[model samples]
Target: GRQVKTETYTNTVTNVPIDIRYNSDKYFISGFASEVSVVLTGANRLSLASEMQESTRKFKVTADLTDAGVGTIEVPLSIEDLPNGLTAVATPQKITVKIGKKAQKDKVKIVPEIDPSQIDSRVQIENVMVSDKEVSITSDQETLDRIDKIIAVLPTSERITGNYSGSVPLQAIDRNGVVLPAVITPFDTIMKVTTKPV
Candidate 1:
């Protein structure tokens, strides 16, 4: 004789927002479904059928500007009882949900430019060390790609001495031209240069 087995499982789905801002009219609703599965685990398992009673759950995903608040919303779900000789296991005992405002997006470029005047005559230019060899500048995708093409050049003739801090400009000439706004942090602490005998 063949054995027949059935199982039932249930879970809840909740939305959680990434960020919230003040005086911002825009709000984002994060939507995702929590799924549960039932399996018949036994020797000589018979035909098993599974069903999801609730497909989706919706609730308010917003926050008030008056008060600084972060809270979670709970959604409830249940499954139909299975037939005799069936067992079910529900994963993620409990689920918490939340919603809030959206984030504002902007972009900036890292342009490395060196100043010859800042360097002391005594030292030679050895190498340049940038904090980030490759950086992701958030902007229009097209503009960002253009910014990446820009490179910082340090001439050997330039002499560098004590600590220096400043912003360098990167210029591009074509219609696709893009300039990077970068703060230059040089790698060389002390530059060695030949001095004429007095």
Candidate 2:
């Protein structure tokens, strides 16, 4: 018998669980704890590892996105969520974001994005489709003008194994791969991904 999991990627990604205290069902969180870091221990000691690369560890950072709409938000990061016998810290110690209300509450085409470079050959993905094809988007006039597409990122996570199908979160991004400050309606959209043996 055999057992295992894990890979390489161009950008840094944290697979840690996040807690969004406020409901962001109708707003776009263009800004939040984007720079937060997770420090993993030796599975025994709660000491900090100063030299760990972001791509090397797995830890979840949670936060809240309360309903405020069309304004700015500032939140202080707290260390209260640290696991038992473990410790953590927020690099900036806080997060701030300038909100862009959906005064234009417009409809935009949905783009399906999948990054498989980091996923090892242990699995294969065949097809990916949005169970529903459209989303209502909101943003400032300028950010919206530059918006070329909307997408529900096909993250290569533990839950992404084999063929997949169901509702997933979505985001609005520009051609430069910049995630926009626009919010999409229907909160979570349905997605169907087909995977098979490699």
Candidate 3:
């Protein structure tokens, strides 16, 4: 009779979804390897099925702003612990990281619109404040270039008494078409202007 021998291997991956973005384009998605190792029981030799490559896989990751104004997202990766008779001895881990604001080209501008009537003669014009100092705006190069020129106009013919507050619509136009339905945060505000009889 002949002697028979058997071997076994075990492995596990954790924190696989490492959210990462491109260095040039922050919006672009990318990922990297965290901690990858192999474990063996009854077997002495082990190897991974595939090695991490630069263009091996492409993943689409969506990022959402948190209450703290930070962007976060999760990345997905396909991992094979065992190639043949190999097993992973250590758990895999990864960290989510952002490339930074400089990498992204998105820009946001805050424009103020006020109605002349809302401005009372008694009260002086104070500085206008926006809820969000900055906003995320996306458009083509031409549109972005003209973004600074965008302005809001509020009708001032009507007499305003007491505190006046309202949201003003902002629009963007281009040769291709007219971009409307754009909104600015803190769209409304309370006017401190004074009132007088006619």
Winning model by lDDT: 2
- Measured by TM-score, the strongest candidate is 2
Put down candidate 3 lDDT per residue, 1-198, tens digits, no spaces. 698765554433333333322443323222324443323333433232132222332222222223212243443333333344443333333234332232213324444566666666655554554443444444323334444423334445644444445444444433344542233333433333333433
C-alpha lDDT score of every prediction, in listed order:
0.35, 0.59, 0.37
TM-score of each: 0.25, 0.47, 0.29
| Steric overlap count per candidate | 3, 9, 4
Order of all candidates by lDDT, from best down to worst?
2, 3, 1
What value does the lDDT take at residue 160 in candidate 3?
47
Candidate 3, residue 135: how far the Cα is off, in Å: 2.3
Tens digits of lDDT, candidate 1, 93-169: 23344434443222233334467685666655554544434332222223333443444434445444644333333
What digit string (tens of lDDT, one per residue) describes model 2 on residues 1-198? Answer: 577542211222233334546534444455565555544443443223322444434344555556455667776655543335444555555677665544454554777776666344778877777866667776666687888777877655626666777667788778898887766787677778787777
For model 1, the superposed segments whose C-alpha errors exceed 4 Å read 1-112, 148-159, 162-198
What TM-score does model 3 achieve against the real structure? Answer: 0.29
**Residue 15 lDDT in candidate 3:** 34
Misplaced by over 4 Å in model 2 are 1-102, 117-120
